[PDB]
Structure formats: C-alpha cells, structure tokens
A = this chain, B = another copy of it.
Amino acid sequence: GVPPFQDCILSFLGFSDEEKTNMEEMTEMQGGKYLPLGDERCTHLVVEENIVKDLPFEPSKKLYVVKQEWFWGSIQMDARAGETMYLYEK
C-alpha cells in the first residue's frame, strides 16, 4: 500500500545520535526521507517531549511538530497517523 512515511521528510529532536540514526534508518524503511533539524524542507519534526521544552528554530507553517508516539504509532498501524492527535506542546 502507501508506506507510512510516503512523501514525508522527517527530522528529530531530543534523541542521542544512536537513537536518531535508528529512527532515520526506520524512516527510510517505512518509505520516507529525513533531513537535519530545522531544514525548511521538513514536513515533520519528531520530538522526545520528555527532553524538549522549546524548539531551537522557528517552524515553517507547514511543519508538523509531533510527539514521538506519532512516529512509532504510524509504524505499528502501517499507516500515517494523524499528526493533529500528537502535536508537541510548550
């Protein structure tokens, strides 16, 4: 079908380099792309909300800034989860 991250360009904040590498590799497995934190091309920023209290750049209007659950939830469901149910706050 449509892989979970088709046409998504992800980025990550709040993860160790080992964790981020794992999530980048999983992103590609699941049909998406990834770019560095703050890249204006990104469609999504996935945050470890237990670590992050603010963002180090001003998001574009298109950017979905989502809690980690959106990422692993999309993979579990084999479908892009609705971002609006998982927005990062504060």
Contacts and interface: CB of A to CB of B under 8 A. Distances in A.
Contacts of A84: none
A18 B28 CA distance: 23
A32 interface: no
A32 B57 CA distance: 26
Nearest to A37: B17
**Interface SS of A by simple majority:** loop
A23 to B, nearest CB: 12
A14 B52 contact: yes
A66 to B, nearest CB: 17
A31 B14 CA distance: 27
B39 A50 contact: no
A48 interface: yes
Interface of A: 14-20, 36-39, 48, 50-57
